[PDB]
Amino acid sequence: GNRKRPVPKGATYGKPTNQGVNELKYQRSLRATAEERVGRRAANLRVLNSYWVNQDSTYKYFEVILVDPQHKAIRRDARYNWICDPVHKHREARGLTATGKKSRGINKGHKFNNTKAGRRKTWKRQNTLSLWRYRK
Amino acid sequence: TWRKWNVKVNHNEKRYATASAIAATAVASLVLARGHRVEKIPEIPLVVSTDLESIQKTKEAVAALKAVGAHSDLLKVLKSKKLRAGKGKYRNRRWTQRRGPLV
Amino acid sequence: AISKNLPILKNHFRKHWQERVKVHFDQAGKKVSRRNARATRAAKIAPRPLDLLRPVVRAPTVKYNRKVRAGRGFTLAEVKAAGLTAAYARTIGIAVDHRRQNRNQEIFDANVQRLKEYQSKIIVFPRNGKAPEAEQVLSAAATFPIAQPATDVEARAVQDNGESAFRTLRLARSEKKFRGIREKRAREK
Amino acid sequence: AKQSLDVSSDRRKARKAYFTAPSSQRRVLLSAPLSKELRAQYGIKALPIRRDDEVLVVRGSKKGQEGKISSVYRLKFAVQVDKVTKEKVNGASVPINLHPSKLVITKLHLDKDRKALIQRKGGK
RNA sequence: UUGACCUCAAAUCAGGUAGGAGUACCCGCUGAACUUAAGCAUAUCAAUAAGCGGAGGAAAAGAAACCAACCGGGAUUGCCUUAGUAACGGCGAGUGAAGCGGCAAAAGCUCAAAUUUGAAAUCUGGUACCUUCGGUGCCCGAGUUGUAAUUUGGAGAGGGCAACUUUGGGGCCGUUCCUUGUCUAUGUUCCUUGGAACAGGACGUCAUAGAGGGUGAGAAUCCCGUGUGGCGAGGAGUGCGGUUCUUUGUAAAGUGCCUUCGAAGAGUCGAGUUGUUUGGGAAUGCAGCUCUAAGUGGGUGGUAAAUUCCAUCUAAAGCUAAAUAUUGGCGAGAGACCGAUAGCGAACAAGUACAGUGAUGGAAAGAUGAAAAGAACUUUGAAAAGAGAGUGAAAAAGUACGU
RNA sequence: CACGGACCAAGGAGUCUAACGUCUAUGCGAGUGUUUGGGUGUAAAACCCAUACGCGUAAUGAAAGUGAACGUAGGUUGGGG
RNA sequence: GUCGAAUUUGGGUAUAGGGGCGAAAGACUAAUCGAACCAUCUAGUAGCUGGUUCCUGCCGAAGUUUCCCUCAGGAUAGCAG
RNA sequence: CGUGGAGGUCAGUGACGAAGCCUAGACCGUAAGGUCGGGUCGAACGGCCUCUAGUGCAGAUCUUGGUGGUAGUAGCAAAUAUUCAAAUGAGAACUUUGAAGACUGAAGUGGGGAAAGGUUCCACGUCAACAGCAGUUGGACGUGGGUUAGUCGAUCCUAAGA
RNA sequence: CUAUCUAGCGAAACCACAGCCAAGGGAACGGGCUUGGCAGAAUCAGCGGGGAAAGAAGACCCUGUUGAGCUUGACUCUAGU
RNA sequence: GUGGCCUAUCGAUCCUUUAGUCCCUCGGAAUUUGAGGCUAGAGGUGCCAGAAAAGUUACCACAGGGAUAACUGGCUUGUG
Ligand SMILES: [Cl-]
Ligand SMILES: [Cl-]
Ligand SMILES: [Cl-]
Ligand SMILES: [Cl-]
Ligand SMILES: [Cl-]
Ligand SMILES: [Cl-]
Ligand SMILES: [Cl-]
Ligand SMILES: [Cl-]
Ligand SMILES: [Mg+2]
Ligand SMILES: [Mg+2]
Ligand SMILES: [Mg+2]
Ligand SMILES: [Mg+2]
Ligand SMILES: [Mg+2]
Ligand SMILES: [Mg+2]
Ligand SMILES: [Mg+2]
Ligand SMILES: [Mg+2]
Ligand SMILES: [Mg+2]
Ligand SMILES: [Mg+2]
Ligand SMILES: [Mg+2]
Ligand SMILES: [Mg+2]
Ligand SMILES: [Mg+2]
Ligand SMILES: [Mg+2]
Ligand SMILES: [Mg+2]
Ligand SMILES: [Mg+2]
Ligand SMILES: [Mg+2]
Ligand SMILES: [Mg+2]
Ligand SMILES: [Mg+2]
Ligand SMILES: [Mg+2]
Ligand SMILES: [Mg+2]
Ligand SMILES: [Mg+2]
Ligand SMILES: [Mg+2]
Ligand SMILES: [Mg+2]
Ligand SMILES: [Mg+2]
Ligand SMILES: [Mg+2]
Ligand SMILES: [Mg+2]
Ligand SMILES: [Mg+2]
Ligand SMILES: [Mg+2]
Ligand SMILES: [Mg+2]
Ligand SMILES: [Mg+2]
Ligand SMILES: [Mg+2]
Ligand SMILES: [Mg+2]
Ligand SMILES: [Mg+2]
Ligand SMILES: [Mg+2]
Ligand SMILES: [Mg+2]
Ligand SMILES: [Mg+2]
Ligand SMILES: [Mg+2]
Ligand SMILES: [Mg+2]
Ligand SMILES: [Mg+2]
Ligand SMILES: [Mg+2]
Ligand SMILES: [Mg+2]
Ligand SMILES: [Mg+2]
Ligand SMILES: [Mg+2]
Ligand SMILES: [Mg+2]
Ligand SMILES: [Mg+2]
Ligand SMILES: [Mg+2]
Ligand SMILES: [Mg+2]
Ligand SMILES: [Mg+2]
Ligand SMILES: [Mg+2]
Ligand SMILES: [Mg+2]
Ligand SMILES: [Mg+2]
Ligand SMILES: [Mg+2]
What we know:
This is part of a larger assembly, with chains A (about 140 residues), B (about 100 residues), C (about 190 residues) and D (about 120 residues).
Chain A: H1 30-41, E1 46-55, E2 60-67, H2 72-75, H3 98-104, H4 119-126, E3 129-131
Antiparallel strand pairs in A: 1-2
Chain C: E1 21-23, H1 27-45, E2 56-58, H2 61-64, E3 68-70, H3 76-82, H4 86-90, H5 105-120, H6 165-177, H7 179-188
Helix pairs in contact in C: 3-5
Chain D: H1 11-19, H2 23-29, E1 31-33, H3 36-42, E2 46-48, E3 54-57, E4 66-73, E5 78-87, E6 93-98, E7 103-107, H4 112-120
Antiparallel strand pairs in D: 1-2, 3-4, 3-7, 4-5, 5-6
The complex binds chloride ion (8 copies) and magnesium ion (MG) (53 copies).
Chain A binds six RNA strands through helix 1, strand 1, helix 3, helix 4 and strand 3.
GO cellular component, one term (chain B): cytosol
GO molecular function (chain B): RNA binding; structural constituent of ribosome
Subcellular location (chain B): Cytoplasm; Nucleus
């Protein structure tokens, strides 16, 4: 379902353009929410990927793939010891998984001008006044 | 901080000023008016031997300038050392002196 | 706030622009660090020229298609025509691009000539380890410059067949405009 | 003029490093030149001052007086000479602080460590 | 009865791991209003502040389901430009990118999908020993509901024929880089003033050293340093310059020709609808619900649709230095900056004294003299002190102290 | 019989920036702009430089588009020298 | 006024800001209540009130026109340098 | 015209006294201001040609700090009340002792505790500040001493609730 | 019991400069200006005529394209159902 | 003779719609629908140079105004 705005009794205290309560949508997918809660449950592991398995009217079901960065079978494996690097801690929290990059709009082409290399970094670049020593 | 600090000057007009400055160095009236002690120097501009470029020691370099007539200008710099007259003394600008010859 | 005869202005300063002002005070500092980086890299890397060999390609778009410039890398066919493999070329100082294709013979021949000239002006030291001492040249692009191909001679003979150049352009423009309708008219009969 | 990027010409930094210098660093700052007789004999210009050294005063109102160094008061950037004191009105006598740069060492108190220092400086 | 398998438990079982802090810069979520429109609701402020989750020395992005329409370009990031432009907008106020071009830096790549099948060839742990960021032997366990080798689209693979070419891993000694120590010039020579010469005058010396500071007043030559070089000590990383011990191997890799093949990711793409967002306008991206594919297929080609072509890439799986950012931390160098009501709130026992139940709020306050030489002693007074005397260049400097 | 001012010292208010109009000074001139960057250096200075890009040298149409000499670059009237 | 009860009161405990609590006065919620206190957004906006720092010299106004949710304000023409 | 800072110059002034400050003393300029003498003082500062700005105050119920007139003025009048002598001391309406006169009148101005305060408790020494007069006294100032549990509480139990 | 006088102790409000009137004119009710009346140090206790006395940037009224509390088939929305 | 004998009898941008030209564009190349432009009208703003808009405050707030009302005083004297 949708994400109801958590305001008391529906009052928003603002302009009518922001008075919506019921028809609002969460910007991350339910698949992303599944990975986050599994990630907190097993904080000694690293989230690799996840996939859809089932659904009903109330719930969607997913299975999350996890890799142990402390196990010697992983640290000695050349194809998977990249995950042991500290830069890959909590990938699902920062949206670095496959579902995370989809919701961030990390793709190529004219359709993704706003989010090619990070939406907020692009906004900073386009809203920055650049001055040189010899003014242009 | 985004106050303008550097000033852009046209390249050709910049060279115009440099050429005018070079020509003024050959006029004895202007050199004397700028405070240099060239009263007893016969010919302006002053050209010396190319052997000056190969001098290694300061003692002989001063002697070479001494023998060509720049002694009075060198002495003027030494006797003009003074303490600055304001708050610039404790901003790494403590002593002021004159300008000597340019080689 | 409108008065007198003045041009309409469009200054975009209605946000918190003062929080994102970037003054390049370190322009001189960055130039020194870039020169230090290039000096340290050259002394460390090898007596090799510090940059890879690049091909010559035609610039796209009708505005710039009259000039040639340096491209990404030599194609697989261009590398093969020079007499070496792509894997070996990358380790010898030649940039290789696998997604560029060859459609023009003049560009293909020029790039093959560059690879042949490059192989004749380098010394590949053996893996044995002797490595006879050689001077380091800091640039491979300056050694092999890119030149604009010649188009026509300085002077020729006037050859007029009587047809108007203006008329030719008008007919070509008109014939393209009515190609679809004329095909439809002929198709219905 | 300064030619190195590691040395600073800032007046503020130079004065802070002097007043906040540790005890070991103040020993070098409290150096005195040797006499004419000692410089010829030893071949060196100046040495850090030490207790039990014989000195001569060459500047100030106490010029010409000699004595042994009784205390090197590093905390005050000064040294005290046994025979150079001042008599208070009540009769008590207090030492007079003197800077080692205004003194001349006439006799050196020697030991194993100072012999090595003289030789490490090229002296004999 | 007994022995397995599957699933699910327990133990202060053997060995590990997560939390909190910091948060300037970085990756996400969530999310205003003041304000502007001379009112005001869309819009604007702003995809901002506040709130929440998560990293590093950078992060993120990244080797095209790209840009293009050209004689085509060819991962990503940043700078100059495109451009206040195309476009959006009570088409009002306002808002607003991208391709090309020049430059900085440059680097490429690997899994899934194939029978090793004449031999699971793979791996954690335990234990003994050794040349100990590991190695060998042995023994349990994991794993066939798939662990190695081989192949990732640029290809490539199974057979056939024919040719030559090319090596692997450490020790030791230098070099490079970092943290440190030590050594390496020249007056205190005369006269005057002064409490003090570091001042003035005279006569010199050194200088690849006349930066800076100290010393009883403006000191290149009194002291520390400064300039130029020499000689050491302790580490890091194999970046590479020479030597030295092993032959890795009926091993591995590259290249020609012929033939047969060529596996490429699903509640995903795509579509409808709702909300949000964008310059994106019959709908730019994202998300919820509903529907739900194909394999000469699929996406894209900035105006919705039917029909016929063309161009260009290969999504729904993954890794990766440099050019870039940095009001935090650590170590340095600087200023046409401020000079104690200034400059940080704080030059001082300053986030201190103090106020508030609490969240929080938050000061004032630098200068005796070169040196205490901080006033012995006499006298009047209960005493504080006064008057003499004394110290000092000066008490018109007396710890209520420069002026 | 309107408002602030009991007194004194120190502090105390048209600034900077982006984009522009008129005028003026300067350089070059159908061209002009070295300083994004590179070279170099006595090192944030000074000095040197390639390719681009901006503006100007053509306008006019919503657009597809087209695109400035009949002539001593015209005639008449007034014009300093 | 009331004084054996709908009495008075200590301690413990519960209810927190568009919320609480109210035998109901818009009363009370730490001297603050017809919406508490604290920090930040925030130097919020103001066609409105106040102030706006040296000398001399020369020139020297306007309260009128048209339009405006315009009437304590602007644009525009005029007057001035 | 004047102020803070910057490039150049006058080989400018200065411990034989720079800057600042005081001065019904002198001189120049229409003026903004400039110059000199005297006193005080103790370490730096100025003229001219140019550069630069956080550059000139009488007011803003302006900011911070300091100081007046008012003025030795308003006032120091609730809680019935004090008096004599001696001792101590430089000093006694107020300290100590004795004597006398009074009050709280057991729902107290008596004797203990809870909350709260934190050494105010006690002794010795001592009076600059504090006790809106005074002070030899003090809950003040300086230096020390003092709180002893198997049975008194906490600790244990549960209440509304957390 | 104060006030009052003495010893000790010792504030505040307020303050452009100040403090004798009549008429006149004047911002249409002067301590100052004009014309007259007049006018002699320094002061103590009282007193409430005046100082349009002091205490607060009028709460009344109007203006502003400034708010807030409350109400209603005002305009536009919304939790819930 | 280019409406009413003359002097009044009326309406921008955006949007919608009609008429005309059957012309221009949909930017990889075409045909047909659809959409967007060009020229001339209509749908209306009467606060008529053209915001889309109900009350109450005796619980009240702020910036101001003697440019402006509720006392004196002044001018005037209809009225008394
Ligand atoms: Cl001096
Ligand atoms: Cl739409
Ligand atoms: Cl600090
Ligand atoms: Cl508080
Ligand atoms: Cl046209
Ligand atoms: Cl609360
Ligand atoms: Cl004057
Ligand atoms: Cl009387
Ligand atoms: Mg255990
Ligand atoms: Mg508004
Ligand atoms: Mg307004
Ligand atoms: Mg409003
Ligand atoms: Mg934030
Ligand atoms: Mg870290
Ligand atoms: Mg980096
Ligand atoms: Mg990364
Ligand atoms: Mg690929
Ligand atoms: Mg690219
Ligand atoms: Mg925006
Ligand atoms: Mg949102
Ligand atoms: Mg990545
Ligand atoms: Mg301060
Ligand atoms: Mg003196
Ligand atoms: Mg007023
Ligand atoms: Mg007043
Ligand atoms: Mg002032
Ligand atoms: Mg009760
Ligand atoms: Mg009521
Ligand atoms: Mg302001
Ligand atoms: Mg006149
Ligand atoms: Mg209107
Ligand atoms: Mg007014
Ligand atoms: Mg003086
Ligand atoms: Mg005077
Ligand atoms: Mg001094
Ligand atoms: Mg100012
Ligand atoms: Mg003042
Ligand atoms: Mg004024
Ligand atoms: Mg005041
Ligand atoms: Mg009295
Ligand atoms: Mg009283
Ligand atoms: Mg009484
Ligand atoms: Mg009684
Ligand atoms: Mg009684
Ligand atoms: Mg007691
Ligand atoms: Mg008293
Ligand atoms: Mg007393
Ligand atoms: Mg005490
Ligand atoms: Mg009168
Ligand atoms: Mg009066
Ligand atoms: Mg009179
Ligand atoms: Mg008012
Ligand atoms: Mg008011
Ligand atoms: Mg109005
Ligand atoms: Mg309102
Ligand atoms: Mg008729
Ligand atoms: Mg008619
Ligand atoms: Mg198209
Ligand atoms: Mg109108
Ligand atoms: Mg009036
Ligand atoms: Mg009558």
